[PDB]
PDB file of all heavy atoms in Angstrom:
ATOM      1  N   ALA A   1      14.578  -6.099   9.674  1.00 39.36           N
ATOM      2  CA  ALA A   1      14.190  -5.824   8.301  1.00 39.36           C
ATOM      3  C   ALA A   1      13.039  -4.840   8.357  1.00 39.36           C
ATOM      4  O   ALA A   1      12.714  -4.141   7.431  1.00 39.36           O
ATOM      5  CB  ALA A   1      13.809  -7.080   7.645  1.00 39.36           C
ATOM      6  N   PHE A   2      12.223  -4.742   9.437  1.00 37.75           N
ATOM      7  CA  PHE A   2      11.137  -3.968   9.607  1.00 37.75           C
ATOM      8  C   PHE A   2      11.320  -3.073  10.913  1.00 37.75           C
ATOM      9  O   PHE A   2      10.583  -3.321  11.973  1.00 37.75           O
ATOM     10  CB  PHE A   2       9.797  -4.690   9.729  1.00 37.75           C
ATOM     11  CG  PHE A   2       9.504  -5.464   8.353  1.00 37.75           C
ATOM     12  CD1 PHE A   2       9.796  -6.780   8.380  1.00 37.75           C
ATOM     13  CD2 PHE A   2       8.940  -4.806   7.463  1.00 37.75           C
ATOM     14  CE1 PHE A   2       9.539  -7.473   7.143  1.00 37.75           C
ATOM     15  CE2 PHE A   2       8.612  -5.468   6.222  1.00 37.75           C
ATOM     16  CZ  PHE A   2       8.885  -6.810   6.166  1.00 37.75           C
ATOM     17  N   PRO A   3      12.114  -2.173  10.943  1.00 38.68           N
ATOM     18  CA  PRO A   3      12.516  -1.406  12.054  1.00 38.68           C
ATOM     19  C   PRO A   3      11.420  -0.218  12.190  1.00 38.68           C
ATOM     20  O   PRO A   3      11.378   0.743  11.423  1.00 38.68           O
ATOM     21  CB  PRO A   3      13.839  -0.781  11.983  1.00 38.68           C
ATOM     22  CG  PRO A   3      13.999  -0.650  10.436  1.00 38.68           C
ATOM     23  CD  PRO A   3      13.205  -1.748   9.882  1.00 38.68           C
ATOM     24  N   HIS A   4      10.580  -0.205  13.207  1.00 39.87           N
ATOM     25  CA  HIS A   4       9.548   0.719  13.529  1.00 39.87           C
ATOM     26  C   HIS A   4       8.640   0.792  12.333  1.00 39.87           C
ATOM     27  O   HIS A   4       8.407   1.933  11.683  1.00 39.87           O
ATOM     28  CB  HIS A   4      10.175   2.031  13.821  1.00 39.87           C
ATOM     29  CG  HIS A   4      11.199   2.060  14.811  1.00 39.87           C
ATOM     30  ND1 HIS A   4      10.934   1.601  16.211  1.00 39.87           N
ATOM     31  CD2 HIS A   4      12.502   2.140  14.805  1.00 39.87           C
ATOM     32  CE1 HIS A   4      12.119   1.566  16.917  1.00 39.87           C
ATOM     33  NE2 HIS A   4      13.060   1.978  16.123  1.00 39.87           N
ATOM     34  N   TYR A   5       8.126  -0.315  11.806  1.00 36.72           N
ATOM     35  CA  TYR A   5       7.367  -0.316  10.467  1.00 36.72           C
ATOM     36  C   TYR A   5       6.079   0.450  10.714  1.00 36.72           C
ATOM     37  O   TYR A   5       5.732   1.154   9.692  1.00 36.72           O
ATOM     38  CB  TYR A   5       7.063  -1.722  10.141  1.00 36.72           C
ATOM     39  CG  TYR A   5       6.425  -1.955   8.771  1.00 36.72           C
ATOM     40  CD1 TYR A   5       7.157  -1.580   7.523  1.00 36.72           C
ATOM     41  CD2 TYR A   5       5.122  -2.392   8.580  1.00 36.72           C
ATOM     42  CE1 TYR A   5       6.589  -1.679   6.368  1.00 36.72           C
ATOM     43  CE2 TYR A   5       4.670  -2.567   7.382  1.00 36.72           C
ATOM     44  CZ  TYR A   5       5.404  -2.185   6.229  1.00 36.72           C
ATOM     45  OH  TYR A   5       4.820  -2.294   5.044  1.00 36.72           O
ATOM     46  N   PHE A   6       5.416   0.418  11.834  1.00 35.36           N
ATOM     47  CA  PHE A   6       4.133   1.042  11.988  1.00 35.36           C
ATOM     48  C   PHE A   6       4.290   2.324  12.856  1.00 35.36           C
ATOM     49  O   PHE A   6       3.632   3.384  12.588  1.00 35.36           O
ATOM     50  CB  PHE A   6       3.035   0.225  12.675  1.00 35.36           C
ATOM     51  CG  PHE A   6       2.770  -1.049  11.718  1.00 35.36           C
ATOM     52  CD1 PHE A   6       3.178  -2.278  12.109  1.00 35.36           C
ATOM     53  CD2 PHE A   6       2.006  -0.869  10.632  1.00 35.36           C
ATOM     54  CE1 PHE A   6       2.800  -3.362  11.336  1.00 35.36           C
ATOM     55  CE2 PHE A   6       1.694  -1.950   9.861  1.00 35.36           C
ATOM     56  CZ  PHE A   6       2.059  -3.231  10.221  1.00 35.36           C
ATOM     57  N   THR A   7       5.131   2.298  13.745  1.00 36.16           N
ATOM     58  CA  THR A   7       5.365   3.491  14.664  1.00 36.16           C
ATOM     59  C   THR A   7       5.868   4.702  13.932  1.00 36.16           C
ATOM     60  O   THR A   7       5.325   5.867  14.170  1.00 36.16           O
ATOM     61  CB  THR A   7       6.384   3.196  15.857  1.00 36.16           C
ATOM     62  OG1 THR A   7       7.715   3.446  15.338  1.00 36.16           O
ATOM     63  CG2 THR A   7       6.214   1.805  16.228  1.00 36.16           C
ATOM     64  N   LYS A   8       6.694   4.510  12.954  1.00 36.82           N
ATOM     65  CA  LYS A   8       7.178   5.612  12.096  1.00 36.82           C
ATOM     66  C   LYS A   8       6.571   5.556  10.601  1.00 36.82           C
ATOM     67  O   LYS A   8       6.593   6.573   9.984  1.00 36.82           O
ATOM     68  CB  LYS A   8       8.612   5.605  11.933  1.00 36.82           C
ATOM     69  CG  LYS A   8       9.332   5.774  13.422  1.00 36.82           C
ATOM     70  CD  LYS A   8      10.890   5.749  13.311  1.00 36.82           C
ATOM     71  CE  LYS A   8      11.603   5.731  14.544  1.00 36.82           C
ATOM     72  NZ  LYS A   8      11.068   6.914  15.498  1.00 36.82           N
ATOM     73  N   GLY A   9       6.266   4.400  10.138  1.00 39.73           N
ATOM     74  CA  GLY A   9       5.766   4.329   8.911  1.00 39.73           C
ATOM     75  C   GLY A   9       4.350   4.953   8.556  1.00 39.73           C
ATOM     76  O   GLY A   9       4.293   5.767   7.673  1.00 39.73           O
ATOM     77  N   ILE A  10       3.470   4.837   9.568  1.00 42.14           N
ATOM     78  CA  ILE A  10       2.098   5.277   9.518  1.00 42.14           C
ATOM     79  C   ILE A  10       2.226   6.839   9.549  1.00 42.14           C
ATOM     80  O   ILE A  10       1.559   7.382   8.607  1.00 42.14           O
ATOM     81  CB  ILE A  10       1.215   4.684  10.549  1.00 42.14           C
ATOM     82  CG1 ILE A  10       1.115   3.231  10.366  1.00 42.14           C
ATOM     83  CG2 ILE A  10      -0.189   5.270  10.430  1.00 42.14           C
ATOM     84  CD1 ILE A  10       0.205   2.565  11.322  1.00 42.14           C
ATOM     85  N   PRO A  11       2.834   7.486  10.424  1.00 41.35           N
ATOM     86  CA  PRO A  11       2.947   8.931  10.345  1.00 41.35           C
ATOM     87  C   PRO A  11       3.599   9.437   9.056  1.00 41.35           C
ATOM     88  O   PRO A  11       3.157  10.433   8.421  1.00 41.35           O
ATOM     89  CB  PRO A  11       3.855   9.324  11.530  1.00 41.35           C
ATOM     90  CG  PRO A  11       3.575   8.273  12.530  1.00 41.35           C
ATOM     91  CD  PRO A  11       3.362   6.964  11.608  1.00 41.35           C
ATOM     92  N   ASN A  12       4.627   8.712   8.538  1.00 40.92           N
ATOM     93  CA  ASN A  12       5.159   9.058   7.304  1.00 40.92           C
ATOM     94  C   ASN A  12       4.248   8.977   6.075  1.00 40.92           C
ATOM     95  O   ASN A  12       4.269   9.863   5.305  1.00 40.92           O
ATOM     96  CB  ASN A  12       6.503   8.195   7.056  1.00 40.92           C
ATOM     97  CG  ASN A  12       7.327   8.598   5.842  1.00 40.92           C
ATOM     98  OD1 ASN A  12       7.759   9.728   5.709  1.00 40.92           O
ATOM     99  ND2 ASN A  12       7.345   7.669   4.806  1.00 40.92           N
ATOM    100  N   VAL A  13       3.414   7.891   6.076  1.00 39.03           N
ATOM    101  CA  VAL A  13       2.462   7.797   4.965  1.00 39.03           C
ATOM    102  C   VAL A  13       1.480   8.901   5.122  1.00 39.03           C
ATOM    103  O   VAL A  13       1.160   9.481   3.991  1.00 39.03           O
ATOM    104  CB  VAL A  13       1.777   6.315   5.095  1.00 39.03           C
ATOM    105  CG1 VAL A  13       0.559   6.312   4.190  1.00 39.03           C
ATOM    106  CG2 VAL A  13       2.709   5.281   4.879  1.00 39.03           C
ATOM    107  N   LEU A  14       1.054   9.328   6.274  1.00 38.18           N
ATOM    108  CA  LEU A  14       0.190  10.433   6.324  1.00 38.18           C
ATOM    109  C   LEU A  14       0.691  11.667   5.840  1.00 38.18           C
ATOM    110  O   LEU A  14       0.070  12.501   5.164  1.00 38.18           O
ATOM    111  CB  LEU A  14      -0.422  10.516   7.786  1.00 38.18           C
ATOM    112  CG  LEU A  14      -1.088   9.419   8.311  1.00 38.18           C
ATOM    113  CD1 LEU A  14      -1.557   9.687   9.737  1.00 38.18           C
ATOM    114  CD2 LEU A  14      -2.164   8.966   7.536  1.00 38.18           C
ATOM    115  N   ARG A  15       1.962  12.042   6.108  1.00 39.33           N
ATOM    116  CA  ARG A  15       2.732  13.165   5.605  1.00 39.33           C
ATOM    117  C   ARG A  15       2.737  13.124   4.179  1.00 39.33           C
ATOM    118  O   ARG A  15       2.467  14.100   3.514  1.00 39.33           O
ATOM    119  CB  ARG A  15       4.138  13.167   6.247  1.00 39.33           C
ATOM    120  CG  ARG A  15       4.798  14.486   6.083  1.00 39.33           C
ATOM    121  CD  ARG A  15       6.285  14.438   5.954  1.00 39.33           C
ATOM    122  NE  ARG A  15       6.896  13.905   4.765  1.00 39.33           N
ATOM    123  CZ  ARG A  15       7.384  12.677   4.652  1.00 39.33           C
ATOM    124  NH1 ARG A  15       7.669  12.008   5.631  1.00 39.33           N
ATOM    125  NH2 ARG A  15       7.807  12.499   3.416  1.00 39.33           N
ATOM    126  N   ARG A  16       3.136  11.939   3.551  1.00 42.45           N
ATOM    127  CA  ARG A  16       3.176  11.973   2.049  1.00 42.45           C
ATOM    128  C   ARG A  16       1.827  12.020   1.475  1.00 42.45           C
ATOM    129  O   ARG A  16       1.679  12.752   0.465  1.00 42.45           O
ATOM    130  CB  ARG A  16       3.837  10.471   1.656  1.00 42.45           C
ATOM    131  CG  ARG A  16       5.233  10.412   2.153  1.00 42.45           C
ATOM    132  CD  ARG A  16       5.568   8.898   2.362  1.00 42.45           C
ATOM    133  NE  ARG A  16       5.512   8.257   0.948  1.00 42.45           N
ATOM    134  CZ  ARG A  16       5.890   6.964   0.838  1.00 42.45           C
ATOM    135  NH1 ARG A  16       6.154   6.201   1.821  1.00 42.45           N
ATOM    136  NH2 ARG A  16       5.795   6.429  -0.391  1.00 42.45           N
ATOM    137  N   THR A  17       0.779  11.469   2.015  1.00 40.90           N
ATOM    138  CA  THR A  17      -0.592  11.556   1.558  1.00 40.90           C
ATOM    139  C   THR A  17      -0.977  12.985   1.609  1.00 40.90           C
ATOM    140  O   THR A  17      -1.618  13.597   0.601  1.00 40.90           O
ATOM    141  CB  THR A  17      -1.507  10.699   2.376  1.00 40.90           C
ATOM    142  OG1 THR A  17      -1.091   9.390   2.188  1.00 40.90           O
ATOM    143  CG2 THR A  17      -2.902  10.835   1.715  1.00 40.90           C
ATOM    144  N   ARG A  18      -0.780  13.731   2.637  1.00 40.93           N
ATOM    145  CA  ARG A  18      -1.141  15.148   2.848  1.00 40.93           C
ATOM    146  C   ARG A  18      -0.561  16.038   1.868  1.00 40.93           C
ATOM    147  O   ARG A  18      -1.085  17.006   1.311  1.00 40.93           O
ATOM    148  CB  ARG A  18      -0.951  15.553   4.331  1.00 40.93           C
ATOM    149  CG  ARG A  18      -1.474  16.930   4.668  1.00 40.93           C
ATOM    150  CD  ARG A  18      -1.089  17.387   6.053  1.00 40.93           C
ATOM    151  NE  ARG A  18      -0.954  16.223   7.021  1.00 40.93           N
ATOM    152  CZ  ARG A  18      -0.599  16.311   8.190  1.00 40.93           C
ATOM    153  NH1 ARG A  18      -0.322  17.490   8.743  1.00 40.93           N
ATOM    154  NH2 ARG A  18      -0.451  15.249   8.992  1.00 40.93           N
ATOM    155  N   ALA A  19       0.727  15.759   1.658  1.00 39.27           N
ATOM    156  CA  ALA A  19       1.580  16.576   0.556  1.00 39.27           C
ATOM    157  C   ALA A  19       0.972  16.395  -0.788  1.00 39.27           C
ATOM    158  O   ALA A  19       1.036  17.376  -1.581  1.00 39.27           O
ATOM    159  CB  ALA A  19       2.964  16.370   0.793  1.00 39.27           C
ATOM    160  N   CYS A  20       0.470  15.296  -1.209  1.00 40.44           N
ATOM    161  CA  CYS A  20      -0.028  15.014  -2.511  1.00 40.44           C
ATOM    162  C   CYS A  20      -1.463  15.105  -2.663  1.00 40.44           C
ATOM    163  O   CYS A  20      -1.997  15.160  -3.879  1.00 40.44           O
ATOM    164  CB  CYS A  20       0.556  13.665  -2.856  1.00 40.44           C
ATOM    165  SG  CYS A  20       2.344  13.309  -2.770  1.00 40.44           S
ATOM    166  N   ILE A  21      -2.308  14.950  -1.605  1.00 38.73           N
ATOM    167  CA  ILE A  21      -3.718  14.853  -1.800  1.00 38.73           C
ATOM    168  C   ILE A  21      -4.345  16.059  -2.589  1.00 38.73           C
ATOM    169  O   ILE A  21      -5.305  15.971  -3.191  1.00 38.73           O
ATOM    170  CB  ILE A  21      -4.362  14.610  -0.441  1.00 38.73           C
ATOM    171  CG1 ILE A  21      -5.824  14.192  -0.611  1.00 38.73           C
ATOM    172  CG2 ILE A  21      -4.483  15.917   0.379  1.00 38.73           C
ATOM    173  CD1 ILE A  21      -5.892  12.762  -1.294  1.00 38.73           C
ATOM    174  N   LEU A  22      -3.739  17.227  -2.340  1.00 39.55           N
ATOM    175  CA  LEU A  22      -4.248  18.540  -2.974  1.00 39.55           C
ATOM    176  C   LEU A  22      -3.627  18.713  -4.376  1.00 39.55           C
ATOM    177  O   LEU A  22      -4.001  19.742  -5.003  1.00 39.55           O
ATOM    178  CB  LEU A  22      -4.007  19.625  -2.061  1.00 39.55           C
ATOM    179  CG  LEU A  22      -4.711  19.782  -0.762  1.00 39.55           C
ATOM    180  CD1 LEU A  22      -4.471  20.941  -0.024  1.00 39.55           C
ATOM    181  CD2 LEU A  22      -6.225  19.520  -1.084  1.00 39.55           C
ATOM    182  N   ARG A  23      -2.866  17.834  -4.846  1.00 37.23           N
ATOM    183  CA  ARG A  23      -2.384  17.853  -6.229  1.00 37.23           C
ATOM    184  C   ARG A  23      -2.696  16.760  -7.131  1.00 37.23           C
ATOM    185  O   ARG A  23      -2.714  16.841  -8.309  1.00 37.23           O
ATOM    186  CB  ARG A  23      -0.761  17.958  -6.258  1.00 37.23           C
ATOM    187  CG  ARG A  23      -0.180  19.100  -5.276  1.00 37.23           C
ATOM    188  CD  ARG A  23       1.373  19.069  -5.364  1.00 37.23           C
ATOM    189  NE  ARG A  23       1.923  19.882  -4.324  1.00 37.23           N
ATOM    190  CZ  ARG A  23       3.119  20.081  -4.159  1.00 37.23           C
ATOM    191  NH1 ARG A  23       4.054  19.490  -4.850  1.00 37.23           N
ATOM    192  NH2 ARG A  23       3.580  20.966  -3.302  1.00 37.23           N
ATOM    193  N   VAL A  24      -3.147  15.588  -6.463  1.00 39.28           N
ATOM    194  CA  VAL A  24      -3.475  14.424  -7.285  1.00 39.28           C
ATOM    195  C   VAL A  24      -5.057  14.219  -7.263  1.00 39.28           C
ATOM    196  O   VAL A  24      -5.735  14.034  -8.351  1.00 39.28           O
ATOM    197  CB  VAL A  24      -2.968  13.115  -6.701  1.00 39.28           C
ATOM    198  CG1 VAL A  24      -3.338  11.956  -7.468  1.00 39.28           C
ATOM    199  CG2 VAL A  24      -1.386  13.349  -6.546  1.00 39.28           C
ATOM    200  N   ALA A  25      -5.769  14.403  -6.131  1.00 38.79           N
ATOM    201  CA  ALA A  25      -7.194  14.191  -5.996  1.00 38.79           C
ATOM    202  C   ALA A  25      -8.028  15.210  -6.911  1.00 38.79           C
ATOM    203  O   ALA A  25      -8.902  14.717  -7.467  1.00 38.79           O
ATOM    204  CB  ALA A  25      -7.479  14.055  -4.648  1.00 38.79           C
ATOM    205  N   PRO A  26      -7.679  16.481  -6.626  1.00 37.79           N
ATOM    206  CA  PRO A  26      -8.772  17.470  -7.325  1.00 37.79           C
ATOM    207  C   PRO A  26      -8.985  17.237  -8.823  1.00 37.79           C
ATOM    208  O   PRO A  26     -10.218  17.280  -9.205  1.00 37.79           O
ATOM    209  CB  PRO A  26      -7.941  18.821  -7.142  1.00 37.79           C
ATOM    210  CG  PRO A  26      -7.125  18.608  -5.933  1.00 37.79           C
ATOM    211  CD  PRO A  26      -6.775  17.220  -6.042  1.00 37.79           C
ATOM    212  N   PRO A  27      -7.965  16.853  -9.713  1.00 40.14           N
ATOM    213  CA  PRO A  27      -8.363  16.548 -11.004  1.00 40.14           C
ATOM    214  C   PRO A  27      -9.196  15.329 -11.074  1.00 40.14           C
ATOM    215  O   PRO A  27     -10.159  15.272 -11.984  1.00 40.14           O
ATOM    216  CB  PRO A  27      -7.018  16.176 -11.585  1.00 40.14           C
ATOM    217  CG  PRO A  27      -6.011  17.095 -10.868  1.00 40.14           C
ATOM    218  CD  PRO A  27      -6.507  16.938  -9.450  1.00 40.14           C
TER     219      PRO A  27
END
């Protein structure tokens, strides 16, 4: 149910955060 939850989840979260941080945060 949790295959590679942190090994792949954490890098994926950083990718998603990086793609959105410059469109959500500045306002």
Side-chain angles (χ1 to χ4, degrees):
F2 296 97
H4 314 291
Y5 189 65
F6 298 109
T7 86
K8 303 181 187 300
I10 299 182
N12 183 62
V13 171
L14 300 184
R15 193 205 78 245
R16 298 156 63 181
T17 303
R18 191 185 322 179
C20 305
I21 195 63
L22 290 186
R23 308 177 188 183
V24 184

